[PDB]
Amino acid sequence: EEGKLVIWINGDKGYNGLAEVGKKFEKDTGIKVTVEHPDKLEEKFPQVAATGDGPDIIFWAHDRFGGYAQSGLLAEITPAAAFQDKLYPFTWDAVRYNGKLIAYPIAVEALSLIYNKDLLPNPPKTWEEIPALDKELKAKGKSALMFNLQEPYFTWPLIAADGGYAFKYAAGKYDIKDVGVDNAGAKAGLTFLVDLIKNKHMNADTDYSIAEAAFNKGETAMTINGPWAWSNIDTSAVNYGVTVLPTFKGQPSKPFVGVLSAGINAASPNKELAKEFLENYLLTDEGLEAVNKDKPLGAVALKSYEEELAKDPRIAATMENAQKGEIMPNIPQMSAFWYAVRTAVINAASGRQTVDAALAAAQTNAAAAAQVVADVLCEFLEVAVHLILYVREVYPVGIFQKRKKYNVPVQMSCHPELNQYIQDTLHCVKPLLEKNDVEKVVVVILDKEHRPVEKFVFEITQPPLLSISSDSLLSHVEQLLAAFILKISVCDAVLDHNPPGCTFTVLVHTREAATRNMEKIQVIKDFPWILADEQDVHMHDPRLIPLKTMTSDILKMQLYVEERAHKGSNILIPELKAPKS
């Protein structure tokens, strides 16, 4: 297929205008450009580019391009700095995967505040003034605001405004374990939304069609919707404005941003012709005008042409909200985010869950990787703690039962109260591990005077994780954890025997000031944790015997033992004591 350009774009786009750009490229270069609009484009591309064929260039929403790239279906693109400067800077952050540019940004789309200019000549700038506005409109038989509450796309702008986010983004990559749906900002935003329903300014049942019908018949002063909705309003007799979404706590609302994007098939022999067509023909005022004249593109990523389009203040408003918004992450973990958050908002809004519990459950289900690593650690710490108590003889050998785990032998207590105390401890730690807030977990051995004799220190690092690749990572990790168990089960040969009558406790060192974690760690009723006293932790003259260190993609960990010479603020400890031996 060398010497031609085959382009796939979706049939709702201006593909006849794109074909006209294709013909000016041909006149000037000889290269014939053929534009096609097949069906089910996004699902056909990973099927036919797996064979190595398909188009040289595919146009689609950017969000799918990050999985294309992890499948290696997209070429890396090499625009000069001077060409990048021609597009709005935030649009390049939507076409980056693993730090590398993988597509050209074309058009930008996001939600705006749409408002009826008979009811509301000046739209509110803050979410905070909508309750008072709705009371004034109710006395006129109207309401202030109606938008889809059934879909998290539409409610996210308010949730994300004060600190919520989907996946954390840095250096052109997403950390699939850093999710911001249950942080302080998300909860404030979802609290405000829920309080609007509580105070009867919105109805929790409102959906897309109910919101559109009501705004378009002059019954509600404002709605929140996208450029796909302008058409129906235009023929509705409502005169409407399109403006920036209100601030929340003085912060911009942050709608999800969609970027129409042009990617290059990694299998293509014409990669250089594709770069030239896209950079010097399409991404120009002349080329975008020809597409936009066929079917409007909305706001565009090329600055000079967007300055022309922005004479339509509707388009200016889309671009301004897009600049303040959150680029929709381009990774396959977004599908778990959407299900999780859709249930959270629906549940919280109809009063079927608390806000804290709705989001907490959404956080652990959107950040499935962070749940997986925390559960692997908690299973391991449980196994480790039992084995420590066996090999150091804190409890007699008759309460233990020989078992298999990580393919090495272990020892598991059958003492129900002991097991219950270790599970309570580890269930409280698990949410802190899910947030990567744990620096150290320390199994402490204490003598009859409640002074520390031994400390088994597990130092924990959880590296940022990208969209998972190695299919044997959990298997490789379990071999690394198995070696920790082997070190523990032969560690009596390196440690002096403990004086008789010892007990044990568990310490958590946190990364930051433990006072923020003081609420997150109280997960079990009647099993509180407190800030540790220096008597609880201070070791008199410690000797540091190292035991094991591992490194892997999901977890770096060091196990060492602090032993006292002669045996015979960021620290949390359970209030309760283990059942004595």
Side-chain angles (χ1 to χ4, degrees), residues 333-400:
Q333 286 72 31
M334 276 302 289
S335 95
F337 168 97
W338 292 117
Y339 287 106
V341 174
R342 178 164 44 247
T343 298
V345 171
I346 280 169
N347 278 358
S350 60
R352 298 302 301 115
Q353 284 181 286
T354 283
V355 168
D356 284 356
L359 290 175
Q363 172 88 23
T364 71
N365 291 317
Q371 196 189 353
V372 161
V373 167
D375 291 321
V376 159
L377 265 173
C378 278
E379 294 177 24
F380 166 81
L381 292 175
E382 185 175 34
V383 171
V385 167
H386 284 240
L387 192 57
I388 288 185
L389 299 178
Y390 174 90
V391 299
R392 311 304 294 142
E393 311 173 359
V394 179
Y395 292 89
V397 319
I399 85 180
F400 292 88

Side-chain angles (χ1 to χ4, degrees), residues 63-77:
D63 58 272
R64 284 312 170 256
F65 279 13
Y68 289 177
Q70 72 180 27
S71 295
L73 310 175
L74 293 189
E76 175 177 3
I77 71 165

Side-chain angles (χ1 to χ4, degrees), residues 369-444:
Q371 196 189 353
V372 161
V373 167
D375 291 321
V376 159
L377 265 173
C378 278
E379 294 177 24
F380 166 81
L381 292 175
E382 185 175 34
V383 171
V385 167
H386 284 240
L387 192 57
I388 288 185
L389 299 178
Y390 174 90
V391 299
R392 311 304 294 142
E393 311 173 359
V394 179
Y395 292 89
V397 319
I399 85 180
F400 292 88
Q401 193 107 348
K402 184 174 191 155
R403 302 290 310 187
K404 177 189 189 176
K405 187 56 169 171
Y406 311 104
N407 292 321
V408 310
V410 306
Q411 295 289 347
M412 298 302 288
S413 147
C414 282
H415 187 306
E417 307 81 358
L418 175 59
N419 295 4
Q420 190 60 71
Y421 180 93
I422 300 165
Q423 293 189 276
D424 291 353
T425 299
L426 296 182
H427 287 172
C428 293
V429 178
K430 182 185 148 173
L432 268 54
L433 287 165
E434 273 178 284
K435 297 287 276 184
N436 189 14
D437 287 326
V438 172
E439 189 200 358
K440 298 177 175 89
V441 185
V442 186
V443 181
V444 181

Side-chain angles (χ1 to χ4, degrees), residues 1-7 25-26 30-34 56 268-270 273-274:
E1 39 178 2
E2 80 193 308
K4 299 181 183 308
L5 282 181
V6 177
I7 299 187
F25 184 81
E26 175 175 10
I31 305 298
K32 194 170 69 188
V33 176
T34 156
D56 300 277
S268 179
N270 307 290
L273 301 180

Side-chain angles (χ1 to χ4, degrees), residues 177 373-374 377-378 381 425-442 457-463 506-514 516-517 520-521 529 555-557 570-572:
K177 81 183 183 46
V373 167
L377 265 173
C378 278
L381 292 175
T425 299
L426 296 182
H427 287 172
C428 293
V429 178
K430 182 185 148 173
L432 268 54
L433 287 165
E434 273 178 284
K435 297 287 276 184
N436 189 14
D437 287 326
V438 172
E439 189 200 358
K440 298 177 175 89
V441 185
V442 186
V457 178
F458 294 80
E459 205 169 0
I460 300 167
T461 288
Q462 313 190 44
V506 179
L507 308 177
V508 177
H509 291 52
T510 61
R511 293 199 183 286
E512 60 275 351
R516 195 272 308 274
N517 299 107
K520 180 174 258 306
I521 208 182
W529 300 61
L555 175 70
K556 300 161 60 49
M557 174 170 269
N570 73 324
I571 308 190
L572 299 168

Side-chain angles (χ1 to χ4, degrees), residues 16-58:
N16 284 322
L18 180 65
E20 297 183 15
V21 177
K23 276 152 53 188
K24 176 171 187 272
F25 184 81
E26 175 175 10
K27 303 312 164 290
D28 301 359
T29 58
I31 305 298
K32 194 170 69 188
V33 176
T34 156
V35 174
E36 291 161 346
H37 53 286
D39 277 349
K40 290 155 275 294
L41 202 143
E42 64 285 16
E43 268 84 38
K44 198 162 301 174
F45 183 71
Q47 290 169 9
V48 76
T51 77
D53 270 337
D56 300 277
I57 306 180
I58 176 181

Side-chain angles (χ1 to χ4, degrees), residues 167-190:
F167 292 99
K168 178 72 73 177
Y169 180 80
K173 44 172 149 281
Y174 286 99
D175 177 2
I176 64 171
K177 81 183 183 46
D178 190 349
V179 170
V181 329
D182 83 324
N183 56 20
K187 289 183 182 186
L190 183 58

